[PDB]
Amino acid sequence: SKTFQQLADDILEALKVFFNPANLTPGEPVLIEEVKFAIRSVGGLSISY
Amino acid sequence: MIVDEFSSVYECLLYCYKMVKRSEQLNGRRVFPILSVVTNNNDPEGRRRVKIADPLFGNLIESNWIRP
Amino acid sequence: MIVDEFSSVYECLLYCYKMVKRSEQLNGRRVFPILSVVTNNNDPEGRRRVKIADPLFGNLIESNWIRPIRVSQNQDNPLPQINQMVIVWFVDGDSEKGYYLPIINDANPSREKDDPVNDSAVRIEGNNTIRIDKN
Amino acid sequence: MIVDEFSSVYECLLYCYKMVKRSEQLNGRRVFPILSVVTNNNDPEGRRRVKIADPLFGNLIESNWIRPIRVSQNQDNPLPQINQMVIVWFVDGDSEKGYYLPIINDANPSREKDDPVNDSAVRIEGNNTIRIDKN
Amino acid sequence: GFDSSDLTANGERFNPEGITAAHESLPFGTLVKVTWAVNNKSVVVRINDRGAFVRLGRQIDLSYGAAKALSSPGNDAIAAGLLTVKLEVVELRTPIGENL
Amino acid sequence: EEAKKKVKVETVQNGNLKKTLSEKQLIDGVKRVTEYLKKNISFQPRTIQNILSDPKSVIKIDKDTGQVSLFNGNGEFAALVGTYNGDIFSPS
Amino acid sequence: PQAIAKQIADIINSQWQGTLTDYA
Amino acid sequence: PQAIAKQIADIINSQWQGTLTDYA
Amino acid sequence: LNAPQLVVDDYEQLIIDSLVHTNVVSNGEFTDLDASGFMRPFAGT
Amino acid sequence: LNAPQLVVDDYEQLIIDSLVHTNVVSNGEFTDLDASGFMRPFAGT
Amino acid sequence: DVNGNPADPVTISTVGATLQPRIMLGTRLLISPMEVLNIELELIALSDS
Amino acid sequence: TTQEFLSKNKTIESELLDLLIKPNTDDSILTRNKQAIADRDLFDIEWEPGQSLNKLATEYLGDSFAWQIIADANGIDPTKEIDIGAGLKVPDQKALENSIKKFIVNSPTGKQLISDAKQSILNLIGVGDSNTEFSKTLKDCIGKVVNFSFDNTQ
Amino acid sequence: IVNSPTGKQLISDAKQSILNLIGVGDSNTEFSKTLKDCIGKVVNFSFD
Amino acid sequence: ITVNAKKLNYTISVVDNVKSLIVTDQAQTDATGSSQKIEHYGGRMTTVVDADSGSLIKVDKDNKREAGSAARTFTTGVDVPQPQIQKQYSNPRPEGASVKEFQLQLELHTSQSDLENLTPDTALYIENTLPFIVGKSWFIESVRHSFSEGIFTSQVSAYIPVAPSQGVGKLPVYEILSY
Amino acid sequence: LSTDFIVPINFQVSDLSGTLRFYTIGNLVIPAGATFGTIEAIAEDIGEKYNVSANFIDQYSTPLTYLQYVTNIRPATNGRSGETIDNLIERCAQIIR
Amino acid sequence: KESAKNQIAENLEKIKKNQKELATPEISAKGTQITLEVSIDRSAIAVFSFLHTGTKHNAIISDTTTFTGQSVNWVLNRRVKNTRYTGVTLKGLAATITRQYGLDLDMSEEGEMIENISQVSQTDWQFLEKMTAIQGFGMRTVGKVLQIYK
Amino acid sequence: KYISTSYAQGGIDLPIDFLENPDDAKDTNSASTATEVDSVGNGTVSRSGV
């Protein structure tokens, strides 16, 4: 449903939003499930690994 | 446009109105080349420029640097 | 026509009517000489003409061929190089009849001299050929 | 004066009556440089002046003596020959004050060069005299 | 692997049968006369590509058609992989005639 | 005076509606459009469901003509679904 | 009003033809 | 008629003098 | 943000708009818009 | 292509043209076009 | 193709993509470029001037 | 070489030509009479002995050939017999669309008919238009063709 | 008078009821203001 | 010449002591007006050539408005460039407060306050009139006070402006003498 | 060139005579360093008189900087002044079946 | 001089670029169309089209608003241009100029082929006027279409 | 109606893309594909450009 370039741009933008220091609490562990959810919230893809 | 001998005053004026633009642009300009006397040829910048005494200012004031 | 202080609206209008003709002729002409950058100097006709980028057209459109001026008849001096600045006159104010002469700029700097006024410094980047029929 | 769209007939007439002075001055003048053919180059006064056949007078009437232009002060380069074309400027636009410079035509063609841009080709049909006071 | 699908540095599709060459430093559109010393035959090529292999002392790389244009009866340019050639620059000109 | 004149004139049915949609009417129109699209997703063209699956895709309702359109994440025009006037949404 | 506005053009126009003819 | 043509001409003349001395 | 205005700015405008809406609903049939019409008393009240 | 129009745009024009035709056919001898003329009732009918 | 030559494989693929949702399920669609036979004509004729 | 293709379900390329049949109602013989006039401009009259559409057109409308206007008002065949005491709707002359032919008297062809003056050479909607997509919104609401000002002047 | 980077503007102030009553029918406001608020007809909506 | 330069403001009303109000608007065009008028507009020599390097620099934003759809083949300027005045900075952009977007002719009965407070240094505010005139500062172009008999008459011409390294490289060798 | 070059949309080209005139479909962007590239053009008017052979269009009216030459690498085709009635009938019937 | 030449060349490349002003946002109903349908005896209606360009209004008592509109040639005479044309006929030049504004061209005669000419500080209407006058042609405007005739 | 005018802003009132048309594509740039090469064999090969 999206081109590879569009998917990559969307995922990169979503991750840059996720890893904003305003959206991160210092000293708190990064949860891989949360990262995968942030990636999937882009849409148009299915995470394998 | 072509303003003939069968034209009205308003059109005579309008023709002048549109065609006087070039004359307006000529105001405060120098239309023709001039003849002048070189008074200074020592250019501090080494750009081979000279200063002149143009008849317009009657040698009362000095001019700008003039390039070769 | 001495249009003095005591004048009617019609006398002033007549003065304007009889006088705007030179300015009308000036419309669509080039009154003053211009400064331009040489962009092409390969003249296929062998007439030593160059193409310029005049500021009027903002380097958007290419101009016409512009013919050289010499001080002597049988002198063929070196042409301006690409990106060098020249001064251009327009015969009869026509944009298509242009005649150029190079000036001292920075792409065209001044040569080193002991006396900048009296000394003559000349450099030729190609061959130099002088022929003298008499002594 | 900013004579904008909301302007009265009298404001427009006043604007025309003030900006037409340059056009009045240009009347009976010579605004642009001209191209002319040299018809006489024997100057009795020894001032290296030439006579031209300018297109304005259609070769009916002879013109006034036209004074030369040189690049440096103490060079007296060869004069244009008869029937050669020159470019003429008129100082203050006066037809009686003309100054010329040779151009490249066919009566004055281009000299043969290996590279037309950098090489210099010069021919003198008379004597060549160069005197240098310093080294 | 150089076929009509490749793009030359000129931005044009590569024509192997054309009289073209890739030069290390010449501007595109420059016309270079290449003279083969074996048969003293010269062909003018148009520099359009820039060349992929650099090697050593390799100023020019002719196309297949340009190399074929150098062949003469009894001398096949394609037969010899490397050609010892002379390179010159040519330009459109007006012929020099008698002064008139 | 203008309202009854505009009522007398038959509506164009291809341009501006006689009644311009208000904000609450726009909310109700987006509700109806979303309902229809969620009901008819399987019959939607491949192009339409491709953009509908995008979380950054927007619908755009014309306030004066009632036209509803689909725009993808890039903001370029993708497709048109129908028209919403004051009361009913008509798919196209 | 418009009749006289026009009559005025006719006048001004003819007055300015008079000036054209009045001058060398 | 001619009386008023002249009056109008004179009005125009004085109106123009107004403008001449109205502008800096 | 700025608080929304709660009252309607123009109520006769609301009545006229409700009457134009009757025509929209009826697709060019309910054209009556004066007080003598059937819908105007209800809409105004 | 576009559908032809079956009706005539102006039938009075048709009557007039039939009367100019009464003149053309007779070589400028039939020049009466008013209702009192002979052929106008026939052409109008 | 539209130019009168045997089809460009890009046009072949476009045709296949266009016709894929329109063929009967289970059947196979094969697409290959056409062939051209050259015709050489020789005419001997009498004219009426 | 021949490419193999198997049955798909929904492609973008098929949706480029999925459109093939259009049920439009554009000018045609069956769409001439799109607009019908309500009772606000019709008179309900009874059919009496000695009545004809010619008399109704002459009496009410004043033009003998205007009878078609009456016929389209009722959708009846004039050649079929109308019963006596049957209600006909005669349009009134005061509230009617004028049937005056529109022309451009100065055209490259000299004179030509126009039906709307909007699909003609007088439209002027695209003249001097700087696309922008902001001028388009102002075209839609008010039809602003040219701007009035172009100066930067800040 | 209110000051703005554009320029001075005369501004009416009253209780909002009187403001609505005076501007009833939108007679006081200039047509440019009305056209300004309808310039953005196409309104971005979100889809779920 | 700024959009906010009239320090004191004076407000009049149409219902009182006003005899005639004519408001006009026009579309900008380079066909009419003077060369200075089109210079104040977008027309200007954006492209100029410096007489030293010859880099052919640009001094202002182009402005190709209502000129055509090409915008890449023409320049929309004048032939004569503006005279540059500053040492290094370019000539300032047209103020825009000298540009008229509306013209107002106000002929009205003169009063004392209409005599002292009606000067071209004040900002005019006309009330009880058309909505686009109400609430806007009108710049007075000129005021005229005529007196033909006991009556005093005033003519006001006003308008609205559309307006908002470690060191040098090389130096000659010096000699330093401790003293 | 050191920068990307743009031949603008609606760029007029013609043959030697200047009677047949074509206009470019869109903007043509020649990338930096590249010199010679391509774009589609459409005739000024309909008609079969605009179907011309290759290498027939070589003039452009507006002299653009750094632009040297233009040509057509294809013979212009599909210039038509209206299709036949029979072809329209076939097209209509095919829609039905 | 070798570095200065490179600097000049790169500045010449950089100056040719899209660096113009954006479109002015002006919300108004001013510049609309002025259509006129006029008849004298109700036998036929003559239709004309103009573009609104000015307005006048007297507020005091007498309620009078005067609208003014002009032909589409006013669009061609709005902005002063500087451009050059080479190797184009009169019809081709007129066609390009009209396409720049979305106008239609009506010109049966092709006209002569202009080989080299420059438009120096002239509006498109003025340049077209000069080109048509020098070739013995004249222009006329009806609605949207401009026609050039001998 | 026909004299009143209002002016919006480039970014404050509208998106900037509302005031530009797609036909006039902005001048982009890219790495030059014509960089002269030194086949001498002493140092890097790219000479022109950046």
DSSP for D99-130, please give it. EEEEB--SSS-PPP-SSTTT-EEEEESS----
At a CB cut-off of 8 Å and minimum separation 6, what does B24 contact? D19, D22, N34, N35, N36
Asked if L65 has any chain Q CB less than 8 Å from its own CB, the reply is: no
The DSSP symbol for M3 reads: -
Phi, psi of C66 (to 5 degrees): -120, 125
* Residue D20 CB neighbour total at 10 angstroms: 24
CA Q5 to chain centre: 33
Question: In terms of C-beta density within 10 A (0-12 exposed, 13-18 middle, 19 or more buried), how is residue F78 classed?
Answer: buried
Chain L, nearest residue to P149 by Cα: L108
Best K8, K10, K14, K18 residue to mutate vs chain L (most L CBs within 10 Å): K18
Q: Please calculate the CA angle P42-P45-P50 and round it to the nearest 5 degrees.
A: 145
- Please state the φ and ψ torsions of residue N100, each to the nearest 5 degrees: -90, 130
Q: How far apart are CA E61 and CA E44, in angstroms?
A: 13
Residue entry with tokens 């900013």? D2
K22 by DSSP, 3-state: which? helix
Q: Do chains P and C touch (3 or more CB pairs under 8 A)?
A: yes
| Residue labelled with tokens 């036929």 | P44
How close C25 comes to chain D (CA, Å)? 10
Chain O contact set for P85 (CB, 8 A): 61-62
Taking an 8 Å cut-off on Cβ atoms, the answer to whether N35 and B24 are in contact is yes
| C95 in contact with chain O, both atoms CB, cutoff 8 A | no
Q: Are C103 and D96 in contact (CB under 8 A)?
A: no
Locate all alpha helices (DSSP H) within chain J, ordered by sequence. 11-25, 39-44
For residue L5, give the chain K residue with the closest CA: K29
User: L34 at the K interface (CB within 8 A)?
Assistant: no
Which residue is closest to C86 within chain B, CA to CA?
Answer: B68
Q: Residue E26 forms beta bridges with which residues? A: none
In Å, how far is C9's CA from the nearest CA of chain G?
A: 9
Residues 6 or more apart whose Cβ sits within 8 Å of residue L21: O95
Residues 6+ apart with CB under 8 A from P128: P76, P93, P94, P97, P139
User: Which residue is closest to Q50 within chain O, CA to CA?
Assistant: O2
- Those residues whose C-beta lies under 8 Å from the C-beta of residue L79, and which sit 6 or more positions away, are none
Name the nearest CA neighbour of P132 among L20, D121, B1. Answer: B1
- Residue burial D71-92, b: 16+ Cβ < 10 Å; e: rest: eeeeeebbbbeeebbbbbbbbe
Bridge partners (DSSP) of residue E13 are E7
DSSP Q46: B
Interface of Q with N in 11-50 (CB under 8 A): 23-24
Q: Are E32 and E90 in contact (CB under 8 A)?
A: yes
CA distance O93 to N48: 66
L90 and L47 in contact (C-beta within 8 Å)? no
Q: What's the Cα-to-Cα distance from J3 to each of J8, L27, L32, rounded to whole Å?
A: 14, 8, 11
Cβ distance Q37 to E51 less than 8 Å, yes or no, reads yes
The distance of L16 to chain J (nearest Cα, Å) reads: 25
Neighboring chain O residues of N70 at a CB cutoff of 8 Å: 8, 10
Q: Is the CB of residue C62 less than 8 Å away from at least one CB of chain O? A: yes
- Among candidates C28, C37, C59 on the partner chain, residue whose Cβ is nearest the Cβ of P16: C59
What is the rounded distance in angstroms from the CA atom of residue B14 to the CA atom of residue C17?
A: 10
Burial class (CB in 10 A: 0-12, 13-18, 19+), N158: buried
Using alpha carbons only, give the angle P134, P135, P139 rounded to the nearest 5 degrees: 90
User: N69: which chain O residues are within 8 Å (Cβ-Cβ)?
Assistant: 10
CA distance B25 to B21: 6
Partner-chain residue, chosen from C23, C104, C110, that has the shortest CB–CB distance to B19: C23
Which residues of chain C have a CB within 8 Å of the CB of P1? 106-109
Residue N125 has, within 13 A of its CA and on its CB side, a CA count of 13
Give K-chain residues touching L11 at CB under 8 angstroms: 17-18, 20-21
Instruction: Identify the chains in contact with I, defined as 3+ C-beta pairs within 8 A.
Output: F, M
Reported in sequence order, the residue ranges of chain E that DSSP labels E, i.e. its strands, are 20-23, 31-36, 41-49, 60-62, 85-90
Instruction: Identify all chain P residues contacting L63, using CB atoms and an 8 Å cutoff.
Output: none
User: Which residues from E are below 8 Å from O when comparing CB atoms?
Assistant: 9-12, 28-29, 48
Q: Which residues of D touch E96 (CB under 8 A)?
A: 112
Rounded Cα gap, residues B19 and B1, in angstroms: 9
Residues of chain L with Cβ-Cβ distance to Q23 below 8 Å are: 131
Asked if F62 is an interface residue toward chain A (Cβ–Cβ < 8 A), one would say no
Kindly determine whether residue M39 and residue L142, on different chains, have CB atoms separated by under 8 Å.
Answer: no
J with I: 3 or more CB pairs under 8 Å?
no
φ and ψ at residue P93, rounded to 5 degrees? -65, -45
Burial category of P109 from C-beta neighbours within 10 Å (exposed 0-12, middle 13-18, buried 19 and up): middle
Residue P144: burial class (beta carbons within 10 Å; 0-12, 13-18, 19+): buried
Identity of residue O34? A
Looking at CA atoms only, how far is residue O31 from chain E in angstroms?
Answer: 8
- Cβ-defined contact of J6 to L29 (cutoff 8 Å): yes
Please give, rounded to a whole number of angstroms, the shortest distance from the CA of Q50 to a CA of chain O.
Answer: 10
Distance of alpha carbon B47 from the chain centroid: 25
Rounded to whole angstroms, how far apart are CA atoms P34 and P141? 15
- Give the integer Cα–Cα distance in Å for C104 and D71: 13
Nearest CA in chain G to C8: G19
- Chain L residue numbers touching P79 (CB-CB < 8 A): 150
Residues O86, O11: Cα–Cα separation, whole Å:
37
Neighbours of chain E (3+ CB pairs under 8 A): C, D, O, Q
End-to-end CA distance of chain B: 42
- Sorted by sequence, the CB contacts under 8 Å of residue D75 that are 6+ apart come out as C71
Burial L66-100 (b: 16+ CB within 10 A, else e): bbebbeebbeeeeeeeeeeeeebebbeeeeeeeee
Question: Looking up tokens 């007939």, which residue turns up?
Answer: D9
- Residue G11 CA to residue G4 CA, distance in Å, equals 10
The yes-or-no reply on N/M contact (3 CB pairs or more, < 8 Å) is yes
Question: Rounded to whole angstroms, what are the CA distances from D100 to C89, D45, D64, D80?
Answer: 13, 17, 12, 10
Residue type at O9?
I
Q: State how far the Cα of P98 lies from the Cα of P95, in Å rounded to an integer.
A: 5
Q: Contact E100/D112, CB-based, under 8 Å?
A: no
* L74/P contact by beta carbon, under 8 A: no
Q: Are E65 and C16 in contact (CB under 8 A)?
A: no
Spatial separation of the C-alpha atoms in residues N140 and N143, rounded to whole Å: 7
| Residues found in chain E | 100
Contact between C126 and D112 under an 8 Å Cβ cutoff? The reply is no
Instruction: Report residue N113 as tokens.
Output: 């306050």
End-to-end CA distance of chain L: 66
DSSP string of Q1-27?
--S-EEE--TTTTS-GGGB--TTS---
In terms of Cβ atoms closer than 10 Å to its own Cβ (0-12, 13-18, 19+), residue K21 is middle
Q: Tell me phi and psi for residue D25, to 5 degrees.
A: -65, -35
Angstrom distance (rounded) from CA E15 to CA O36: 14
O-chain CB neighbours of K2 within 8 Å are 78
The tokens 């065009």 sit on which residue?
A: N29
Here the tokens at position F61 are 């309702």
What's the token pair of residue P139?
Answer: 């222009």
Residue in the block written with tokens 């206007």? L69
